[PDB]
Amino acid sequence: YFQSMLAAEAANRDHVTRCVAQTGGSPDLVAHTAALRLYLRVPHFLTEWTTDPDRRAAVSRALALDIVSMKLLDDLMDDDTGLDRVELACVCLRLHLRALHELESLARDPKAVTDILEQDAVHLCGGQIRTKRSRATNLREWRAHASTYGSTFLGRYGALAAACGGEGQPADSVREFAEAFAMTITMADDLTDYDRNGERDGNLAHLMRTGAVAGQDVVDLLEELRGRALAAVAAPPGAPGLVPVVHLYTDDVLVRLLPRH
Amino acid sequence: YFQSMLAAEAANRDHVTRCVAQTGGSPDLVAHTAALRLYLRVPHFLTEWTTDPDRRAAVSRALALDIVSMKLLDDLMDDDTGLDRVELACVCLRLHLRALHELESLARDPKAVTDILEQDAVHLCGGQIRTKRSRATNLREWRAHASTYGSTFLGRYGALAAACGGEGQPADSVREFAEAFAMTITMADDLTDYDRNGERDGNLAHLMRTGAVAGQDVVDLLEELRGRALAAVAAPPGAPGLVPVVHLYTDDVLVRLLPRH
Numbered sequence: 313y314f315q316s317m318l319a320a321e322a323a324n325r326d327h328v329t330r331c332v333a334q335t336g337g338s339p340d341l342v343a344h345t346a347a348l349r350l351y352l353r354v355p356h357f358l359t360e361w362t363t364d365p366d367r368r369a370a371v372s373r374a375l376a377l378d379i380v381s382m383k384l385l386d387d388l389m390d391d392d393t394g395l396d397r398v399e400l401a402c403v404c405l406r407l408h409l410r411a412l413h414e415l416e417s418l419a420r421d422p423k424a425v426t427d428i429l430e431q432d433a434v435h436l437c438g439g440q441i442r443t444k445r446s447r448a449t450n451l452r453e454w455r456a457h458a459s460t461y462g463s464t465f466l467g468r469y470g471a472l473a474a475a476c477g478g479e480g481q482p483a484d485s486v487r488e489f490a491e492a493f494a495m496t497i498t499m500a501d502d503l504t505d506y507d508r509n510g511e512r513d514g515n516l517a518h519l520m521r522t523g524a525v526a527g528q529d530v531v532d533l534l535e536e537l538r539g540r541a542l543a544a545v546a547a548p549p550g551a552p553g554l555v556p557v558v559h560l561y562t563d564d565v566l567v568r569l570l571p572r573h
Numbered sequence: 574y575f576q577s578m579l580a581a582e583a584a585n586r587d588h589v590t591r592c593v594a595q596t597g598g599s600p601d602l603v604a605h606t607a608a609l610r611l612y613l614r615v616p617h618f619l620t621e622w623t624t625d626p627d628r629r630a631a632v633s634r635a636l637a638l639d640i641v642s643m644k645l646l647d648d649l650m651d652d653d654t655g656l657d658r659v660e661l662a663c664v665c666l667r668l669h670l671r672a673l674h675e676l677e678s679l680a681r682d683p684k685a686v687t688d689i690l691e692q693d694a695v696h697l698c699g700g701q702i703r704t705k706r707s708r709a710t711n712l713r714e715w716r717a718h719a720s721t722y723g724s725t726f727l728g729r730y731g732a733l734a735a736a737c738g739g740e741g742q743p744a745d746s747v748r749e750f751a752e753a754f755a756m757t758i759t760m761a762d763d764l765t766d767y768d769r770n771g772e773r774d775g776n777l778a779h780l781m782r783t784g785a786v787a788g789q790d791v792v793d794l795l796e797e798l799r800g801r802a803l804a805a806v807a808a809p810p811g812a813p814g815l816v817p818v819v820h821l822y823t824d825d826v827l828v829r830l831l832p833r834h
């Protein structure tokens with residue numbers, strides 16, 4: 313099942329790029345949203361605890377919609393991309409409105425969705441505002457900024473994934489996996505995004521390159537995140553299928569990322 | 574009651590600027606969202622058909638939240654403003670999430686909100702994408718672009734306003750008022766926004782200044798929009814309180830806007 317994954321990634325990549333295009337997406341944007349592999353695939357992982365296949369394929373795409381929406385919300389603020397700003401915005405909002413719509417139907421408690429989304433919208437947002445204001449300058453201090461725009465971000469789709477997955481789901485363990493997994497990813501993004509498009513202010517790669525964070529710490533943490541992640545997957549019932557993934561990813565930062573630095 | 578209005582504008586201006594600030598709003602943004610008079614006031618009009626005072630004050634603020642959210646969504650795409658992009662985005666999303674949350678509680682049919690929002694999200698969005706792509710060059714052709722980002726935009730809060738206002742509301746007449754009123758506003762924005770911050774491509778002011786639209790047509794339409802608006806206010810029960818407003822505004826474009834051109 314390092315198949316089931318790319319099949320859902322293909323299925324979610326299709327649903328999204330079809331909403332993107334039919335809304336006025338340009339050939340550079342449908343193309344952009346189609347190439348957001350990780351985002352499109354992540355939903356599959358968040359719904360691993362979900363039993364019925366259809367409802368699984370269901371919530372997997374719903375999440376993929378809002379996740380990309382959110383993504384484009386970024387690209388519009390970061391402003392790098394080079395795509396048109398007008399589209400990025402509409403399409404963003406479009407996709408969202410939609411995810412809300414579908415997620416809202418796959419819910420047991422309709423009111424449930426808007427709950428999760430609101431619960432800490434202040435943390436998620438004030439956290440990414442301040443994150444980019446007072447750029448971090450040390451681990452205990454980067455792992456704090458990464459705990460918001462990263463951990464809490466995915467934490468929520470984790471919760472949604474659970475509120476729309478169908479009763480008998482380790483509600484909070486799903487979230488634990490989400491929040492844990494998410495950070496290993498952020499480190500994966502920082503350790504890579506320094507080399508590729510030369511970055512440096514607040515970056516987790518720079519802070520290592522200037523004795524502001526010991527490589528041994530980075531690792532310690534990366535190893536804790538696996539621990540924390542693998543822990544939540546076990547929680548009963550348990551998501552055997554994710555055990556391989558958690559390793560596959562954490563092992564990838566360790567193997568091909570941390571070495572460059 | 575050209576009082577009840579500024580009192581609700583003051584009440585909605587407060588609710589919003591308090592969410593904006595507590596989320597990380599900068600002193601230039603809380604200041605910006607506080608000065609968005611029209612947006613903050615419009616909700617009051619959309620809930621004129623609503624009987625109970627509390628639920629009215631209720632849905633009036635809820636709408637004010639998403640309306641500003643949407644506004645800032647713009648400012649981020651237009652990109653003019655000069656505020657930080659990171660905030661505009663977060664705060665935007667914040668405010669939204671919130672409006673959804675409150676509106677969602679003042680609903681009879683929870684699922685109802687996400688319905689309205691989705692119903693034509695493709696029209697609202699594809700409409701504002703294409704609107705700015707193939708910039709308009711004549712009335713029958715500007716009044717078409719204005720029929721989306723403008724009419725349908727407010728049409729929806731109109732519908733929400735009705736789905737959260739409380740049974741026994743001219744569901745569709747509220748929307749008629751919204752969509753009608755909205756366009757008179759857009760003309761008010763174009764007829765003014767040409768002089769102020771020198772604009773010209775697709776602008777309803779330019780197209781008059783180059784024989785692409787006869788002033789007599791502009792007026793004909795402005796007069797139809799009042800007709801259409803005043804019509805929906807009458808629809809039973811009827812919103813006597815809005816009759817003065819509809820005039821007050823349409824009469825203002827006629828009196829102090831159309832003359833400059």
Ligand SMILES: CC(C)=CCC/C(C)=C/COP(=O)(O)OP(=O)(O)O
Pocket residue numbers: 382383385386436437440461462465498501505662663666
């Ligand atoms: C609060 C909001 C609107 C957040 C933006 C959405 C988000 C968390 C994107 C993840 O990007 P990333 O952190 O994985 O990397 P990159 O900066 O390259 O997109």
Ligand SMILES: CC(C)=CCC/C(C)=C/COP(=O)(O)OP(=O)(O)O
Pocket residue numbers: 401402405643644646647697698701722723726759762766
């Ligand atoms: C579809 C989206 C996200 C639309 C933006 C929100 C909106 C309709 C703002 C109204 O602005 P306006 O038309 O009254 O004038 P201005 O361009 O000056 O803000």
